[PDB]
Ligand binder design. Structure first.
Ligand SMILES: Nc1ncnc2c1ncn2[C@@H]1O[C@H](COP(=O)(O)OP(=O)(O)O)[C@@H](O)[C@H]1O
Ligand SMILES: CC(=O)N1CCc2c([nH]c3ccc(C)cc23)[C@H]1c1cccc(O)c1
Ligand SMILES: [Cl-]
Ligand SMILES: [Mg+2]
Length: 335
């Protein structure tokens, strides 16, 4: 930090947790930026474990709130010509995809641009077009989507590809730090009225990979990349040619050895960047080598650690909070 930002988003109870008679064990204090977990296991009030983060979003935080607090500062950075990454990390069913992608409201009540349930990806794409159209920047938007599953790469935006084809990755000559994902489809989003059809297809090919290859999004990393080419011109001012890049990663469930290793490697990359340790283990997983260029800096990185509020998931919630705390060691302040 302030470059690496680690924030926590707790979701509301789900129906499963109600029917299991789960109890609320998480308290989220946005002002003090703390999350407290009752380790109540025969002990009360005994065992409240407190963690402090850059931000904390209670179960009632709306999609727009997450965008404003987390994405806006990062997108301004992207538009300035820099290369950023936002992660969603946590146990399956705590809201990684809800945060990253969102959902449509019931319906057909909103346009996709006004839908309160829309997540980071569609909101970012809409804002890129709003901001850059509004100030008259000459720009082009292109997007790729790949899923890392079982240490294999899959292109989710290739129309004629097939779900079963794996992509190859090489190191970039002209850029140590970079890689080339041969044949990765980079679709051009010509206007904000193209984005929705594009996202639909990507989600459709995601569904096909799961049905056939048993490639469950639960156990795969989703990397949605958006690259913006910007020429900005002012008479008696400045002529700026910039290229911004934003990666929006929806990680595999934090709860098969290639997932543990890749997520733990990611944790070590982050900590090393925060700690400013000379050694950062990019090479050690495909996820972190793919994202190496968007990580060291000068870059904004944000991790949204997602948690459930229910006692039913105490172990995985503490696991998630430990992970997040390992990544960026923020200290508890006095109450
Ligand atoms: N912050 C939140 N607010 C409201 N509902 C949420 C939130 N986070 C997750 N959900 C709901 O939880 C369910 C599963 O979330 P999902 O996006 O699949 O999480 P994950 O990506 O970790 O599996 C969905 O029905 C989603 O609508
Ligand atoms: C069916 C559905 O929920 N959607 C359709 C496709 C989709 C949504 N977000 C996404 C983020 C990444 C990818 C690869 C697909 C989608 C999502 C959505 C897009 C735009 C506004 C919204 O409120 C919701
Ligand atoms: Cl501490
Ligand atoms: Mg998911």
């Amino acid at each position: 930090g302030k470059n690496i930002q680690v924030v926590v988003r707790c979701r509301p109870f789900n129906l499963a947790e109600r029917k299991a008679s789960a109890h609320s064990i998480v308290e989220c204090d946005p002002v003090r930026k703390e999350v407290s977990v009752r380790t109540g296991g025969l002990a009360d009030k005994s065992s409240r474990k407190t963690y402090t983060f850059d931000m904390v979003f209670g179960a009632s935080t709306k999609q727009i709130d997450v965008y404003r607090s987390v994405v806006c500062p990062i997108l301004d950075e992207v538009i300035m010509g820099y290369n950023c990454t936002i992660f969603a990390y946590g146990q399956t069913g705590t809201g990684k995809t809800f945060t990253m992608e969102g959902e449509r409201s019931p319906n057909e009540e909103y346009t996709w641009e006004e839908d309160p349930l829309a997540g980071i990806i569609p909101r970012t794409l809409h804002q890129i077009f709003e901001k850059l159209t509004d100030n008259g920047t000459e720009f082009s938007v292109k997007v790729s989507l790949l899923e890392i599953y079982n240490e294999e790469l899959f292109d989710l935006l290739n129309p004629s590809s097939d779900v079963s084809e794996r992509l190859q990755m090489f190191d970039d000559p002209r850029n140590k730090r970079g890689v080339i994902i041969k044949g990765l489809e980079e679709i051009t989003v010509h206007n904000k009225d193209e984005v929705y059809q594009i996202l639909e297809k990507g989600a459709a090919k995601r569904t096909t990979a799961a049905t056939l290859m048993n490639a469950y999004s639960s156990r795969s990393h989703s990397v949605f990349s958006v690259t913006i080419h910007m020429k900005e011109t002012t008479i008696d001012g400045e002529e700026l040619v910039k290229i911004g890049k934003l990666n929006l990663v929806d990680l595999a469930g934090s709860e098969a050895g290639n997932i543990n290793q890749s997520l733990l490697t990611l944790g070590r990359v982050i900590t090393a960047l925060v700690e400013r340790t000379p050694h950062v283990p990019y090479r050690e997983s495909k996820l972190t080598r793919i994202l190496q260029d968007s990580l060291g800096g000068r870059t904004r990185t944000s991790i949204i650690a997602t948690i459930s509020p229910a006692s039913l998931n105490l172990e995985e919630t503490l696991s998630t909070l430990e992970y997040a705390h390992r990544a960026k060691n923020i200290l508890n302040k006095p109450e």
